[model samples]
Target chain A: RTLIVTTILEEPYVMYRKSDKPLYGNDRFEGYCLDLLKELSNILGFLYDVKLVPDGKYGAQNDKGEWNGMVKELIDHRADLAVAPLTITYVREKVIDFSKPFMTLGISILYRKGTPIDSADDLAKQTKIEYGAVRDGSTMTFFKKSKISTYEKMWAFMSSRQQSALVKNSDEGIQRVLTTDYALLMESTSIEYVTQRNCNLTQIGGLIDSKGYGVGTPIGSPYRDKITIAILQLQEEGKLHMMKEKWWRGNGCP
Target chain B: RTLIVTTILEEPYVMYRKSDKPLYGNDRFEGYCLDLLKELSNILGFLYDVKLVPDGKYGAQNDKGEWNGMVKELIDHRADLAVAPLTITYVREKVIDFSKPFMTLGISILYRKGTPIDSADDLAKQTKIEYGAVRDGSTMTFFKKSKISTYEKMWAFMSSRQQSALVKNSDEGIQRVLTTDYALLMESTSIEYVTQRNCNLTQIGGLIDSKGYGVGTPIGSPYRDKITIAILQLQEEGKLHMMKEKWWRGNGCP
Candidate 1:
């Protein structure tokens, strides 16, 4: 059986493979998520067509509770699978079924070195160094919905200048952190990847919260349970961890 | 709609409520699990009858791959729900559906107060102090299926003395730890509850591995999603945490 896999373009998780000649279909992609999908297809004995999410966003609900990006695609049954670094949060898990986390991570700060900030509290107590997350991403949603006083203050600061502070994606946020006195609130795994490639960038403080990235499927889909089982099998077999190493391995910085 | 809920009796999670008069139906039970069931029913608007699992086992797959306890009740559709301290595991997830974890926990050692053993590694290296888990329970299954050398060694020691080591339930295991020179591998939350109430027993080491207790439903049951959403709502509203505090509160041992 053939399935459509909806994913977003993100470093290490999903990325375009460089080729002289035009690469088409699944050949055009090379990343950890694609590798994950391949292994799943092999074990489950199914064919898949990998397609990038049209909006180039991970997914978050609006004030009206409307969802966008890969999550919405799954909710609308526009795709059979959403295999990307999509965070599993309470809001999204309501409408979509997720395989147990293939990767566990938490939100953290991505800031340039030589910054005075050491933790979220540092950023919360100051406004000189601007900070924000990807607009409408799970990180922003977390801050927006969080009742914790520190996070609530941070959310207020981010929302007050929403147009300038909130970036489109991780790339934009990373660039902002590199170019300006700005800190990026993003997933810890992404922060690790960014700081690895750019030695000047460092993760500030410990994790803000804990969550996982899971394979998303439409609600009540028959494939959901099967996918969960397969992920667990791959985890037990050590394949998932190995795939992560294959992607996240980078030259150590002094 | 009416629902049949299968549960196991365990302190703090599910237990026979003390009554002055004869009690029947849901009234016979009162504890964390019953509170959770009541909340779920309130949110989802369903009437339920709580019944104790016939076999009095939390559930585990045998050598022949057959399942028992509340898990089987859901698999056979004899009950519409399984609300208890049932861990959401890979094997169980395959056979049935689970709502997002209402409570997160990990496997740890429950032992008598004074002991040189500080961690799982301590027990793994020794043979004199016997350690085991509930027979065919998730803890035993984790050790049996684990590939880690330390856990593998421990499992070997456990399996070799299968007749004397593995207990029938948490109560039995706790009793063994108190009365004998033994350590019981059990969930951290359960260990917390036990140690709080009994000064002579304490939890050894940090968690071995992380998991959660989730509400179970028959595979493809329409209520699975509704239940999951309700659980998330309760979590966001802090009701889940409040419930845990209510049931887990105990006088300080020190």
Candidate 2:
């Protein structure tokens, strides 16, 4: 059987290139997940092709199960799987069956060096702290409903004026914090990257919430079981951690 | 025999009060540590007095057997026991005998909402993530020498800048992240307090390092055995966990 797989440009996870590119099936875009998928294909005796799609369009097509983009192309019977950094949220779970999370993440904070900020208590006591984040990011939503006693005070201090400058991408928000004293609250993944390259910032504290990224497929898809099994096997083999280190630790992907 | 005890101001652990102005035989300052001392006094058939002292001065005095601070107060014949948040580090362990750890802590991170910073990898990949921390704090030291590829980069980045303006306290760093988007990396205890209050921020990963705080006495102090036993008893009675929740979680002291 031939199976088409749709992926995205979730950098460091899925890097896209033209299909006829010579580096196809090479180290680029080939890590733990890709390797696992290849092994699964061999076991299942299926031929597969990996295709890339844009972020926004992939979601829209996946929702309607139509071939709008590459992922949708797969859902419309054009592909058999969608593998990328597709987070397994409850809403998406309704439409798709996801293999157990291949990668887990929790949001965290990134701050500049030498700030008086030490703990939440210190943050609560100060009105001078300037916190910025992506406008529609999950962290922003978390901030809106956060239970910190000083949250209201901090919000009032920022008022409506200061809040408008918050950006929408992790890279931009982090840059703002790095270049200025303004702190950037973002995913550990994004902050880790910035903090690694720059000397002034680091990740503080633990996760606010636990989330996972999974391999997604249309609901009732038969591949769900096989993918889940494959994920677990990869984990047991320590391939997941190895792949994560290979791509993010050294120079960009091989 | 009169036994002199050394202690420091650690709030709820050993606090100074206006009403208990005079260093006394019995006062509010003579709480848990004192109570335990009195019990040991009765068992060993001895009289004791609790004395307040600055930690640094105590260390200085102890070196010369001058009974001024906690350690000196003990070796100089002014005090016999010391109960504080005195950590049992390798250096200190060589100079003083310590009971089993009464408190344990690990380094952790805290971030505001929407930071793409999750793990060490995330922080390493992104260049713009900023981290604020105390210039001399233990977390800072650990981060400086951290073996993790990403953490090492962050350490170098922060070190290249003027050290005076970086994070000075855990609370301040946390506050920066909460209000401005900068992540605060500090002790787990501090992180717990902030997370308890500000649900928006959270601890992202496991402890960076493992260590413990223990009761201290002169190297050959005879009371060490009894205190160690008492500490174990407290643990068995669940008093330790209860106290941790009460003090750190604001559930009221046990």
Candidate 3:
């Protein structure tokens, strides 16, 4: 039986494969998650079908206490697995199970060169360089719930002009950063990918917070333990690193 | 009832508290792990008695396929928890359950300043400067089992002079670096602690492999989920970073 995998399109992790000729089925996608899914299927002896999350949003809870995105799909049993750059957070863990992280990253700032901002503290202390994370993502959640004065201040700033400061997704944030004097707070791995491709952009500082991206499964799914074991194997055998290098490699920007 | 915590003596993570007057029982110990245990106790609402593993090993399986140290203690039901800098590995996970990593780290090179080595490849290519990790530790295990050519070559060098190269523990490995032209392959966090305290020593390169430290419990322990949830709470709240800074801070290295 094939596992129904749900994921969101994120560069270098899950993406639509560009080709000259028509590509169909699984071949339509090509990225790190596809490779990882291939490996998991090989190890666990399962077939799979991948479908992008319909809403095109990472999971987040609404004010009505309703979950949305891939998380809702898992809760609703619309998907058996979520193979994406889904950050493992406390709130998410309560509703769904996560395999041990296949990749670890943290929230970091992405800004154009000559921004005159060095860190989250710098952004918090000034209003000149507008800074905010993707609306309703973990990075935003972190700031909203943080008691740390700097992050709390940042949250206040973002809340005051939510529509102007926050972007819909990483691509929107990146576009804003390239065109405006905006600093985008995003996960470090994505920042690495962005900075590598856009030499004009640089990660402002080291990660402000630490977390990991885990393969998501429905709570009580039989596949969770097996997936965790397979992930640990890939980690120990260095396949995870190899896959990351294969996807993250870009022409050096001078 | 008190949970028995079996840990090893690792600087910053766990160590004997020095004082003008003799301290007793748990009072005799103080460090990051002690602080962590205090926090875990606070959240889990359980009394705990700290005990050092008699053998002073992190944990490993011998040639006879028998486990030893804190892992064995957990397997034998002698310790309810192992809260040291014990690395979560494939073999250990097979025998014991681990909380989601409380702290992430990776294998790295620890060496004296002025060394010609810049990375694991540099050490692997030459034989003049001897290198090794703590005998039978996770760092050593990584090299022993690695298919990566650089690590395989380094492992061959260590295996050839196993007696002289591999030290009993991180303490011994650090001493070797201090006393001779040697390099120690160790966990990045330990290297950070050493390099912070001893300016002459520095981390040679970025981490070679990623892994993390987790609180280990018996294979079927019900406490694993609770501890994992507690760690996530602390991580999200930034207490983990604060604790790390509190313990890792040292006088300026000039």
Q: What share of the true interface contacts does each candidate keep?
A: 0.21, 0.00, 0.55
Model 2 lDDT tens row, B1-254: 67666777544465554673555544746344554555455555767666676453434323454434455555555567777655444334445666655566666777765565675556556557666477654456556555556677777766766753367555567667877746666667667767777777788777655555667777667676456555544543345555666655643322
Clash numbers, per candidate = 0, 86, 0
Q: What are the RMSD figures for all models against the true structure?
A: 4.1, 19.6, 1.6
Per-chain TM-score of candidate 3, chain B: 0.97
Best-fitting candidate, scored by lDDT: 3
As for lDDT, the candidate ahead, 2 or 3, is 3
Give the native contact fraction of candidate 3: 0.55
| lDDT (C-alpha) at residue B158 in model 2 | 67
For candidate 1, the per-residue lDDT at B28 reads 86
**lDDT for B63 (candidate 3):** 83
RMSD of 3: 1.6
Give me the runs in candidate 3 sitting further than 4 Å from their true place.
A20-23, B20-22
lDDT of each: 0.86, 0.59, 0.90
Say which docking band candidate 2 falls in. incorrect
TM-score of each: 0.82, 0.43, 0.97
How far does residue B180 in candidate 3 sit from its true spot (Å)? 1.2
Q: Best candidate per DockQ, number?
A: 3
Model 3 lDDT, full chain set: 0.90
**Candidate 1: fnat, from 0 to 1?**
0.21
